[PDB]
Amino acid sequence: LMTDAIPYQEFAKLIGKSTGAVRRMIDKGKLPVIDMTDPQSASAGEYWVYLPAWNNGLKLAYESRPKEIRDGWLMWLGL
């Protein structure tokens, strides 16, 4: 991970969603976000998704479910 943040459009390209969809996600408050904005103004600008927060969040979320649902699917592979 050379960069811990990517513009929300690239993040949109990664998850296969449109740009507008992702901006709507940001406005609804669904994504870890940093704002790049000219110092000489006061509200925004470039919305960058911060990836460590995102992935650590996904990790927490996936580990917090009970092991039944979480680990059940592995039986379909022979585990």
From Swiss-Prot:
> What are this entry's molecular-function GO terms?
DNA binding
- Name the InterPro entries on file: Cox_sf, Phage_P2_Cox
Q: What are the record keywords, sorted?
A: DNA-binding, Early protein, Repressor, Transcription, Transcription regulation
What family is reported?
To phage HP1 cox.
What Pfam families does this protein map onto?
Phage_Cox (PF10743)
According to the lineage, what is the superkingdom?
A: Viruses
Q: What the protein does?
A: Repressor of the Pc promoter which controls gene C, which codes for the immunity repressor, and int, whose product promotes the site-specific recombination over att.
Name of the protein in question: Regulatory protein cox
Upper lineage ranks?
Answer: Viruses, Duplodnaviria, Heunggongvirae, Uroviricota, Caudoviricetes
